[PDB]
Paper text:
Uniquely among microbes to date, P. gingivalis also produces a secreted PAD (called PPAD18), which protects P. gingivalis during acidic cleansing in the mouth through ammonia generated during host and endogenous protein citrullination. PPAD does not require calcium for catalysis and is genetically unrelated with animal PADs and, like the latter and cysteine peptidases, its main catalytic residue is a cysteine (C351 in PPAD20). In contrast, PPAD citrullinates C-terminal arginines like those generated by the prior action of Rgps17, which may be facilitated by the surface co-localization of Rgps and PPAD20.
Author numbering: 44 to 464
């Protein structure tokens, strides 16, 4: 059964989908097209859940026949009731300064093998599992990686024996969430997953579904988009709100961000798909945006598509860069950057650099950041002139062979600010 545990030793920080992923978790019998599994396995580890050695051999034959990169295919043998790995698998969080853990919860649907599955996931990854006593659904959860999470109103109505404050406190204790944004549902739907209408694309970017003016959800979604555009995000700027127009219930927000690739389910028409992919491409410079057609037997649905049938897996040895950027004309008066870098592999970190460029001229220059205290690195931009334009990003490496940048995509989309002092 679900086993409640004490919460993880603090501080805790839930890991966002756009942070480094060591793998992606899918399930057999499949709910996704083989073409998607082949694309995933080209660059990333694909973990497939199977119920037996027999099913594992069936899957290996299908992957071989389809030309899947078998060197990137791993398996977990466990019973499951469904292929909605988004919804019942564990949630990832960093805790105890430099550990990666899994958070289990009471799955909100009567599928006991799905509900039990996180134990097998933690065992496979060799990480600790914590049991947060809330009725939850992964499809209805997203975090920005800076302590905010968005969920539909189901997060309170399915935990109605607790007060909202008790629900928020569990999210704080197990996932480090300091703003549990459970948004109102004016239509009070029986099922309402945030990934059907909203998606953080970055700490400062959110995609909100848009529908035609006469659709019954038109005003509710316009209100949601205005709510996010009017408020401050983790980086101190307003959210950038992007809109994916669903003319006919296309699940365009139900995408998967996996490292530098974004897999977007597409159902047509082709012009409306192209418009939606161009919103993702505009929102996420440097990323590879891939439209993915559905499998004929298990097609994408408006309320259930690619994000619902995948789950990114964090890196147990994550080389994590925590940084709040200095941006625009609001970067001063102190043009000093700070980055906290920790190795969850307990590896030796070296080097920690600021790569920067002035007025878009020449190659990026690397400067070693000063380690003022353990895990705390700084760099001051000096000798700049009024109205100079800066691009910069953070780079770190460790002796486990990990290499990371902040932002994740690195040099293709660095942080930008203007010298106003
Ligand atoms: Na569970």
């Amino acid at each position: 059964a679900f086993q409640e545990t004490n919460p993880p030793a603090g501080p805790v920080r839930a890991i966002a989908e756009y942070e480094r992923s060591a793998a992606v978790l899918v399930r057999y019998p499949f709910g996704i097209p083989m073409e998607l599994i082949k694309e995933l396995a080209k660059n990333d580890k694909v973990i497939t859940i199977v119920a037996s050695e027999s099913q594992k051999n069936t899957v290996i034959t299908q992957y071989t026949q389809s030309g899947v990169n078998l060197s990137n295919c791993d398996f977990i043998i466990a019973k499951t009731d469904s292929y909605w790995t988004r919804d019942y698998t564990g949630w990832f969080a960093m805790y105890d300064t430099n550990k990666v853990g899994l958070v289990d919860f009471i799955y909100n649907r009567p599928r006991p093998n799905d509900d039990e599955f996180p134990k097998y996931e933690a065992q496979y990854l060799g990480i600790e599992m914590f049991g947060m006593k809330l009725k939850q659904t992964g499809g209805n959860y997203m975090t920005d990686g800076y302590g905010s999470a968005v969920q539909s109103h189901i997060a309170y109505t399915e935990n109605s024996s607790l007060s909202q404050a008790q629900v928020n406190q569990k999210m704080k204790d197990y996932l480090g969430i300091t703003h549990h944004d459970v948004v109102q549902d004016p239509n009070g739907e029986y099922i309402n997953h945030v990934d059907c209408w909203g998606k953080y694309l970055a700490p400062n970017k959110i995609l909100i579904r848009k529908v035609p003016d006469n659709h019954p959800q038109h005003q509710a979604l316009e209100d949601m988009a205005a709510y996010f555009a009017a408020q401050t995000c983790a980086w101190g700027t307003k959210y950038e709100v992007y809109r994916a127009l669903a003319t006919n219930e296309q699940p365009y927000t139900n995408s998967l961000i996996l490292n530098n690739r974004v897999f977007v389910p597409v159902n047509g028409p082709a012009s409306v798909d192209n418009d939606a992919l161009n919103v993702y491409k505009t929102a996420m410079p440097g990323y590879e945006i891939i439209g993915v057609k559905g499998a004929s037997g298990t097609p994408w649905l408006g309320t259930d598509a690619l994000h619902c049938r995948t789950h990114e897996v964090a890196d147990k040895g994550y080389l994590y860069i925590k940084h709040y950027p200095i941006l625009g004309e609001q970067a001063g008066p102190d043009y000093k950057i700070e980055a906290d870098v920790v190795s969850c592999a307990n590896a030796t970190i070296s080097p920690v650099q600021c790569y920067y460029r002035i007025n878009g001229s020449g190659s990026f220059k690397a400067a070693d950041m000063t380690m003022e205290s353990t895990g705390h690195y700084t760099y001051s931009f000096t000798g700049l002139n009024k109205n100079d334009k800066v691009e910069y990003y953070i780079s770190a490496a460790d002796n486990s062979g990990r290499k990371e940048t902040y932002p994740f995509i690195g040099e293709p989309d660095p942080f930008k600010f203007t010298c106003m002092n």
